[PDB]
């Protein structure tokens, strides 16, 4: 529980130190979620998954992907942005669009399922600007306190010696751009893959190959984006 336990016991070592400036704010978010349940509203993803992106090592992040907020359908969000459990189908629309672009950019076949854990395990941080949502209500937790947490995460990543490429999908993600100004960091921005915006510049944006070109240009290894 984020209200009950400290960062050292919720997230990976590097992340617990990175997020020290927002320790109280994370506990406050736990209190917010408690108050939602007390008031008769629910949230997604499950409590134990909310901070899941911060359970993969901070020092190993090469690429940061940032979306808006978690999937609004019960049974979709898993605490890694855009990912779904391997048994979920049909895929949510944003994910189908991401995979459409993945195939066009990289030439790989469509993935077998919507599980993006391989990316997380290879140094891609799958974040959202806001880490919870009320079921069936996109953006419902905007402005409730998560933004300070994800701002802190991004500043910390940018302050590392380690190279970073950021991919910012949509307007809320784009508000992280000022914090990404560091010599060791470069940001790709596009419209969000949702059907509401994808035709404004998500399709054709080739984020995966661009990220790899940027990594290689700062002397880092490219991501193996290939999903099974």
Ligand X SMILES: O=c1[nH]cc([N+](=O)[O-])c(=O)[nH]1
| Contact positions vs Cl ion (CB under 5 A) | 41-42, 135
Q: Is residue 56 a contact point for ligand X (CB under 6 A)?
A: no
From the candidates 24, 59, 69, 100, give the one annotated as an active-site residue: 69
Q: Is residue 94 a contact point for ligand X (CB under 6 A)?
A: yes
Q: Which residue is nearest to ligand X (CB)?
A: 67
Q: Is residue 123 a contact point for ligand X (CB under 6 A)?
A: no
The CA–CA distances, whole Å, from 115 to 1, 79, 106 equal 25, 12, 18
Q: What residues contact residue 224 under an 8 Å CB cut-off, 6+ apart?
A: 122
Scanning 51-59, 63-71, 110-118, 177-185 for contacts with ligand X by CB under 6 A, the matching segment is: 63-71
Q: In what order do the strands lie in the sheet with 164-169?
A: 124-128, 63-67, 164-169, 185-190
- Binding at 42: pick from ligand X, Cl ion, none (beta carbon under 5-8 Å per type): Cl ion
Which among 29, 185, 167, 51 is positioned nearest to 101, based on CA atoms? 167
Q: By three-state DSSP, how is residue 160 classified?
A: coil
Contact residue for ligand X among 70, 111, 114, 123 (CB under 6 A)? 70
Q: First CA to last CA across the chain, in angstroms?
A: 33
Scanning 24-32, 65-73, 103-111, 176-184 for contacts with ligand X by CB under 6 A, the matching segment is: 65-73
Report strand pairing: 63-67 vs 164-169: parallel
Contact residue for ligand X among 26, 51, 68, 98 (CB under 6 A)? 68
Q: How far is the CB of 124 from ligand X (least distance, A)?
A: 13
Q: How far is the C-alpha of 173 from the C-alpha of 36, rounded, in Å?
A: 24
Catalytic residue check, 69: yes
Contact residue for ligand X among 56, 71, 102, 208 (CB under 6 A)? 71
The CA–CA distances, whole Å, from 163 to 54, 59, 192, 207 equal 18, 10, 24, 17
Residue count at the site for ligand X (CB under 6 A)?
10
Which amino acids are annotated catalytic?
Answer: 69
Interacting residues toward ligand X by CB under 6 A:
67-71, 81-82, 94, 128, 194
């Amino acid at each position: 529980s984020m209200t009950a336990r400290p960062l050292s016991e919720l997230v990976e070592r590097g992340w617990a130190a990175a997020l020290e400036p927002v320790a109280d704010q994370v506990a406050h978010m736990g209190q917010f979620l408690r108050a939602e349940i007390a008031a008769g509203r629910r949230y997604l993803p499950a409590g134990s998954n909310v901070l899941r992106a911060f359970t993969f090592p901070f020092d190993n992040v090469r690429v940061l992907i940032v979306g808006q907020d978690p999937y609004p359908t019960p049974g979709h969000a898993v605490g890694l942005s855009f990912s779904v459990a391997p048994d979920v189908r049909p895929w949510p629309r944003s994910l189908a669009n991401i995979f459409d672009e993945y195939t066009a950019d990289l030439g790989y076949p469509l993935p077998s399922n919507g599980d993006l854990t391989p990316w997380a395990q290879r140094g891609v941080l799958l974040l959202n600007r806001v880490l919870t949502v009320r079921p069936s209500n996109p953006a419902s937790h905007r402005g409730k306190g998560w933004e300070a947490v994800t701002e802190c995460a991004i500043r910390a990543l940018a302050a590392r010696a380690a190279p970073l490429v950021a991919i910012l999908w949509g307007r809320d993600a784009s508000t992280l751009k000022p914090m990404l100004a560091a010599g060791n960091c470069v940001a790709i921005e596009s419209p969000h893959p949702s059907p509401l915006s994808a035709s404004r510049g998500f399709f054709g944006s080739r984020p995966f190959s661009r990220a790899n070109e940027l990594l290689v240009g700062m002397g880092a290894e490219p991501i193996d984006w290939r999903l099974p």
